[PDB]
């Protein structure tokens, strides 16, 4: 049921979720909304290259999407991310 401790690097009112095959996304549990951008993190700077801020953490893989938009694959929660693991956490 209810549990608390450490936030999953996400703003207030939102909740991270995964699509059928494990696609991480940001949903508004309140209005069942679905968006790709993370609120806590800026709009302009969403797809950042952590390589300049710090190495990728355990359980992760960096890649590029067809449009050339890099992402990451976390093998901790078995999913694919859009925003960096450190971005949201600053």
């Amino acid at each position: 049921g209810p549990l608390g401790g450490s936030p999953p690097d996400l703003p207030e009112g939102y909740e991270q979720r995964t699509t059928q095959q494990g696609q991480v996304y940001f949903l508004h549990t309140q209005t069942g909304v679905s968006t790709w951008h993370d609120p806590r993190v800026p709009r302009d700077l969403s797809n950042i290259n952590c390589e300049e801020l710090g190495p990728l953490p355990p359980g992760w893989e960096i890649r590029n999407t067809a449009t050339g938009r890099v992402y990451f694959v976390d093998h901790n929660n078995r999913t694919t991310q859009f925003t960096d693991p450190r971005l949201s956490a600053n």
Binding site: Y71, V73, F82
Partner: peptide, 20 residues
């Protein structure tokens, strides 16, 4: 074929590797 939204498909679903 459209999967989701008009053109909003950035991070590919999970499976250790970009699985369609």
């Amino acid at each position: 074929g459209p999967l989701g939204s008009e053109l909003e498909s950035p991070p590919p679903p999970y499976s250790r590797y970009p699985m369609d």
